[PDB]
Amino acid sequence: HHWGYGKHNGPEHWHKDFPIAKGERQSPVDIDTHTAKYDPSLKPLSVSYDQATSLRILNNGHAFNVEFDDSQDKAVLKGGPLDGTYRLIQFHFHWGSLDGQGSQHTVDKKKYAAELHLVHWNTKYGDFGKAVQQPDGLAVLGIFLKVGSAKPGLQKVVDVLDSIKTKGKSADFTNFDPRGLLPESLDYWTYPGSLTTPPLLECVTWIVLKEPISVSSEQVLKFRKLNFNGEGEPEELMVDNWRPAQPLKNRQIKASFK
Ligand SMILES: [Zn+2]
Ligand SMILES: [Zn+2]
């Protein structure tokens, strides 16, 4: 029926409604560190989030999105492998039912507890909807989460989860600064890919940070308490909202570091 992460509508079935699932530039992938090519022509990333305006948080039935005002160049990403300015629209996570799984991307087959996705769209296309139809329409920063020490900057997000428990619920979520979720180093790997969920469009330049951020057990614990279902429907915990690694095919992963 409609796509999700269960046995009956899970990743292995998406291709029936989204044939691009079997495409040539699907995500996520396993990052083989010994085959990734250092490319010294890659520029340092430029993250300008000082004017970031968060507006809302929503449980859309497959994750929780924190949405930003993208009506202007307030929070942008540039540099790295990018040409042009990319505007932040929303961030969300992918996580597991257990600490040993949850991330999309893997590093030498290692899975992390979760993966944060900061989604940006190429301003040359004027709106998000047009940007997704272009090969260079989006730029996604992926940040791994390992369980260890608590991440202070994530707490405001954790505490509001109770109020958007089920699908379709939203809550005002202003004055959240995304800079509290960045690791210390901005070293990355990059490759041409796609959205990790339906519609799986091949419009993303992926920028995966080498350094993971740490979250406490209790923080990741609150993620696992959300529900995939709407209110008054049988309870299905939101967990394991991730997709297995896709073949690399004709692609090269480049590293900004050696
Ligand atoms: Zn994602
Ligand atoms: Zn596209």
What is the C-alpha separation between 40 and 36, in angstroms, rounded?
13
Residue 34 C-alpha to ligand 1 middle, in angstroms? 25
CA angle 218, 53, 188 (to 5 degrees): 65
Find the catalytic residue in 2, 62, 105, 120.
62
Structural domains in the chain, sorted by start: 1-258 (3.10.200.10)
Around 92, how many Cα atoms within 13 Å sit in the side-chain half-sphere?
A: 22
What is the C-alpha separation between 100 and 111, in angstroms, rounded?
6
Q: Which ligand lies nearest the alpha carbon of 202?
A: 2
Instruction: Based on the residue annotation, tell me whether 62 is a catalytic residue of this protein.
Output: yes
Q: What are phi and psi of 116, to 5 degrees?
A: -85, 135
Q: Which H, E and C letters describe the chain, residue by residue?
A: CCCCCCCCCCHHHHHHCCHHHHCCCCCCCEECCCCCEECCCCCCEEEECCCCCEEEEEECCCCEEEEECCCCCCCEEEECCCCCCEEEEEEEEEECCCCCCCCCCEECCECCCEEEEEEEEEHHHCCHHHHCCCCCCEEEEEEEEEECCCCHHHHHHHHHHHHHCCCCCEEECCCCCHHHHCCCCCCEEEEEECCCCCCCCCCEEEEEECCCEEECHHHHHHHCCCECCCCCCCCCECCCCCCCCCCCCCCCCEECCC
Q: CA torsion sign, 175 to 205 to 182 to 168? A: positive
**Residue 105 marked as a ligand binder:** no
In single-letter form, the type of residue at position 167 comes to K
Residues in the chain: 258
Residues with CB under 5 A from ligand 1 (ion): 117, 196
Cβ(66)–Cβ(208) below 8 Å:
no
Q: Which residues pair with 162 in a beta bridge?
A: none
Residue 136 C-alpha to ligand 2 middle, in angstroms? 7
Q: Which ligand lies nearest the alpha carbon of 141?
A: 1
Structure-solving method: X-ray
In 3D space, the residue among 243, 225, 236, 245 whose CA is nearest the CA of residue 64 turns out to be 225
What is the C-alpha separation between 246 and 202, in angstroms, rounded?
13
